[PDB]
Design a protein around this ligand. Structure first.
Ligand SMILES: O=[N+]([O-])c1ccc(O[C@H]2O[C@H](CO)[C@@H](O)[C@H](O)[C@@H]2O)cc1
Ligand SMILES: O=[N+]([O-])c1ccc(O[C@H]2O[C@H](CO)[C@@H](O)[C@H](O)[C@@H]2O)cc1
Ligand SMILES: O=[N+]([O-])c1ccc(O[C@H]2O[C@H](CO)[C@@H](O)[C@H](O)[C@@H]2O)cc1
Ligand SMILES: O=[N+]([O-])c1ccc(O[C@H]2O[C@H](CO)[C@@H](O)[C@H](O)[C@@H]2O)cc1
Ligand SMILES: [Ca+2]
Ligand SMILES: [Ca+2]
Ligand SMILES: [Ca+2]
Ligand SMILES: [Ca+2]
Ligand SMILES: [Mn+2]
Ligand SMILES: [Mn+2]
Ligand SMILES: [Mn+2]
Ligand SMILES: [Mn+2]
Lengths: 237, 237, 237, 237
């Protein structure tokens, strides 16, 4: 199975697989059963921002999810990623709907990587930033039902013309260039990603969530991973 | 064939195709016969730095090659890339040798692309920076005799165990991800590239030179482009 | 007197001192009489963005001004800044009103400069970004009627409580740290600036205009420099 | 007196006040007695690099010191700077000597701070980078014995014309512009500092050390702060 590390903004509580009793954010290290979660007072219809950060010095993966004129949800977890992931990988966004549905619209997404070597003045880096997505976004690998072009937006899951969310949908978007997330001769290794999203749904129960993941270069949507599996995992183990 | 826009650091005057009677810097737009050139005091054996800059406000492509504590060659040329290049491209470095030879070593490469829109805050950007190339640089498409790893450098053309450069070689290095070089809805489109090189030669006259180029995504070393054609053009028209 | 290089967004045509008969943008080199201008379809009450760039290779200062979903104004002038300004300067914004008035609101502002000497891999740089101004901007030198914190914006010229602008006002804001605009061993110097502004007036004839400027460390508002002189020049010669 | 938060590179073990019996990297918070430390195998003579990192999500100040192909010391400590420093501060470097001396040469320095807000797309930032120090560095407030220009480096304490370092010397360097280290409603606040240094003593006894410090804007060298106090504190309490 693919090797995956995610930060999930989980909107539907699936109590049978470990989800707490409310919408929340969590750190996923190779399984959908989060290794750490925090309550998140989601706000249907309002644009929000996610901030993920990690540095090899204190070895902690941290996320913050907020809405304007409202409080933020924070989560942090100690993890030596150079002990869980391959040297090179691909980074991306994933999302889904099961029985219940929502829009998993992405307004912007930026990411930065930096490997600073032992030898002075020898850093290597990658930085991209999309504040507008085109119809044919030739630098993004779109998987599942993901599309770009709708008002310069990136729609991870399926949507009807009328603007209605669909169920049992799954879609992901991966940046085209393989990233060198870690390296042995690197003194400091770090990365950061930011995206603004807009989850909006007609139900009284939106499902299922959006997630930012780091995977292997050849990763693909697993079979039947809609709904509770966020298009990331093959099973809820 | 492929569309090419390049900045050539020509070490050998092929006066039969327009080359001036001395090693020069030139701006090639769809042809090996430069639109504008400038004398360059090719200083064999040492490390030089090149800087390429372009912005759509004043539509001027500019270059500057300089050696430490010495003179700088410079060239500019007004060109509206929108008219000459496809919206999406790949960028990269090329180099070749012929009857005569030289080592075409790259010690670091940088690039930045930006698309600022009419809409406030909307800006799309890409930036990569290599200060050390590994033996398996997975984010670089190595074409020809080009290889990475040696002293952490990128060798564009074939060199021997001792260090001696071989004639009639052709290598290329294209960054893996496609670049959105322009967009109609952008108020400002720009790019800057920088790279340090080391050209050495046992010959009384080295050849053929290094080049930075913007080409269509599916480009490759054309057939018979050794020597004077710098691995970029099919013929010499 | 002070040395001033500026890009002016002139809203009131004072034809007597050499002004087009419509709102314009222009390059001001040590004088209020522009060396080059461009017609500006100034929109009342709309938030606009001004982008200014400059590099020592092509030696050309350019500026674009645009409103979303509409046309753009571009202007360029060839000038060697090292033959005009001191090696160390201070950058800033300036605005004024006279017998006629308008609000000169700055919503955001960012700047970047780069000095790259002949010594390979050596670069000095400065960059700031303000996306909201607080009532206590300790890193800005405010002059004249200029104030910050007002709704998170920077008010260059005096306004009222209900909003209404006052005439015969002049204000300026400069970044605290002195900028090293050029030097001896420089291979390439360049700066880029961006600011979003809001201009609205009760009278169907606004005035006078906003301007981005570079000046010597010790620069203050000239005497009687309201109106047509945009708080930058001592006289109209 | 002034409020200090510093990361010290302590070359001399003053056990009588807390220094471990070996050189070390330590994290000081309003006191010369480090809250945390980590053994450091200082390497008299060769160039090193320190990298400080901090963010408000995990409220952890971390640092790494390394030399090429050698042991890198690391230190981290959980601390909420927002509950210790003013919103506006000044960042700088500091070094000192006493009965025993050393060279406290800074060859380069870079800093970056970002204030991300709950209100989306409203970030503020300051970033400077010095790769070559000038004889008249106007953007640096030089205090004590600090001087620039010597071979393009920054000398924090006194060295003779021949190069021999002088005891009982103390100097500082602070960036000219105040830094907004935190605002009451920022969702994320983070900074990163990097510098390369050369410390060498023509005898087997170096002292006293170099330190990156954050203080109130009006900070000035405390009296008798040489030697063991590193030019930061008025006493060893
Ligand atoms: O009413 N219920 O008790 C109840 C309804 C649906 C349910 O699961 C379905 O819908 C969820 C939300 O869309 C997904 O997480 C699941 O993967 C599956 O698609 C489970 C319980
Ligand atoms: O001595 N000569 O008159 C003379 C020598 C070599 C020559 O061309 C050959 O070598 C060049 C440099 O290596 C290449 O650019 C050409 O493509 C070809 O491989 C032409 C004339
Ligand atoms: O319409 N007019 O006949 C007319 C009215 C006023 C005028 O000059 C005044 O107002 C201008 C606009 O504020 C400023 O540029 C001048 O500095 C001065 O303050 C010139 C012509
Ligand atoms: O002989 N010794 O073992 C010995 C020599 C000097 C000494 O203290 C002095 O020198 C230190 C190093 O410069 C400073 O840290 C102190 O502040 C003081 O100025 C203590 C013991
Ligand atoms: Ca769930
Ligand atoms: Ca040639
Ligand atoms: Ca006017
Ligand atoms: Ca000590
Ligand atoms: Mn969950
Ligand atoms: Mn040529
Ligand atoms: Mn004018
Ligand atoms: Mn200590």
């Amino acid at each position: 199975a693919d090797t995956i590390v995610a930060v999930e903004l989980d909107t539907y509580p699936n109590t049978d697989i470990g989800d707490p009793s409310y919408p929340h954010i969590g750190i996923d290290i190779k399984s959908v059963r989060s290794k750490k979660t925090a309550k998140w007072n989601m706000q249907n219809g309002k644009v929000g921002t996610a901030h993920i950060i990690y540095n090899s010095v204190d070895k902690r993966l941290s996320a913050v999810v907020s809405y304007p004129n409202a409080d933020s949800a924070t989560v942090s977890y100690d993890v030596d990623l150079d002990n869980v992931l391959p040297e090179w990988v691909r980074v991306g966004l994933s999302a889904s709907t099961g029985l219940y549905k929502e829009t998993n619209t992405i307004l912007s997404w930026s990411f930065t990587s930096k490997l600073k070597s032992n030898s002075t003045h020898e850093t290597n880096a990658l930085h991209f930033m999309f504040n507008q997505f085109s119809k044919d976004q030739k630098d993004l690998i779109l998987q599942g039902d993901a599309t770009t072009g709708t008002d310069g937006n990136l729609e991870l899951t399926r949507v009807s013309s009328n603007g209605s969310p669909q169920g049992s949908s799954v879609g992901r978007a991966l940046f085209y260039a393989p990233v060198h997330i870690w390296e042995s001769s690197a003194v400091v290794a770090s990365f950061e990603a930011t995206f603004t999203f807009l989850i909006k749904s007609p139900d009284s129960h939106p499902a299922d969530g959006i997630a930012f993941f780091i995977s292997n270069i050849d990763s693909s949507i697993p079979s039947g991973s809609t709904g509770r599996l966020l298009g990331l995992f093959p099973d809820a183990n």
